[PDB]
Design a protein around this nucleic acid. Structure first.
Ligand SMILES: Nc1ncnc2c1ncn2[C@@H]1O[C@H](COP(=O)(O)O)[C@@H](O)[C@H]1O
Ligand SMILES: [Zn+2]
Length: 180
DNA sequence: GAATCATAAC
């Protein structure tokens, strides 16, 4: 198939689709995640093309901080009165091209959350906090990731609120209901 | 039988 039509390039199409945009400014766009893994799941993307955090440098530090500020503003504007819990961060090894910040509510109540890989990509060290990425760029000038990130996606299922171990995705989804 | 694992997608 073509380069432009490859599945890994899909965010570059979605980020230009007005029906998926929830916020736009001179530097970034916010879209709904197409396969949301919680009740609220957005992606913040710069207009400028940066393939992944591997290509980030100090020239991008203001932009990474702006992406974080915009993510916080979207939470306030779209889900603020609910006083929900959110995390903002990056997957250590992404699958989709074009740098994107995940802004995700911590219920993880969604039919698109289907497997252990989904859970652990948001609930282990695989999920890099946005503030931690920002501080690494500021102090070290680039983002580095340690070996062993793919192995974390295989860790047994453990609740993020109470650390209980769960034997299956169905039982995990059932367990999460108690933390609403 | 249900759920996960491990692969494949030409
Ligand atoms: N075309 C798309 N538009 C919007 N979100 C997408 C699209 N394709 C995949 N996604 C989401 O993009 C994210 C890519 O994950 P990652 O590359 O691991 O950061 C996931 O949360 C997907 O659900
Ligand atoms: Zn729990």
């Amino acid at each position: 198939g073509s380069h432009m039509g490859h599945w890994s390039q899909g965010l570059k199409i979605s980020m230009q689709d007005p029906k998926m945009q929830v916020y736009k400014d001179e530097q970034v766009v916010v879209i709904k995640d197409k396969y949301p893994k919680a009740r609220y799941h957005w992606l913040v993307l710069p207009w400028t093309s940066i393939s992944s955090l591997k290509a980030v440098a100090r020239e991008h530090l203001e932009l990474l901080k702006h992406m974080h500020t915009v993510g916080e503003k979207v939470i306030v504007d779209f889900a603020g009165s609910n006083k929900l819990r959110f995390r903002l961060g990056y997957h250590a090894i992404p699958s989709m091209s074009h740098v994107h910040l995940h802004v995700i509510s911590q219920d993880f109540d969604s039919p698109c959350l289907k497997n252990k890989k989904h859970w652990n990509s948001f609930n282990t060290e695989y999920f890099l906090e946005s503030q931690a990425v920002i501080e690494m760029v500021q102090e070290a000038g680039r983002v580095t990731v340690r070996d062993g990130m793919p192995e974390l996606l295989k860790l047994p299922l453990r609740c993020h609120e109470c650390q209980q171990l769960l034997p299956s995705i169905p039982q995990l989804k059932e367990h999460l209901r108690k933390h609403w």
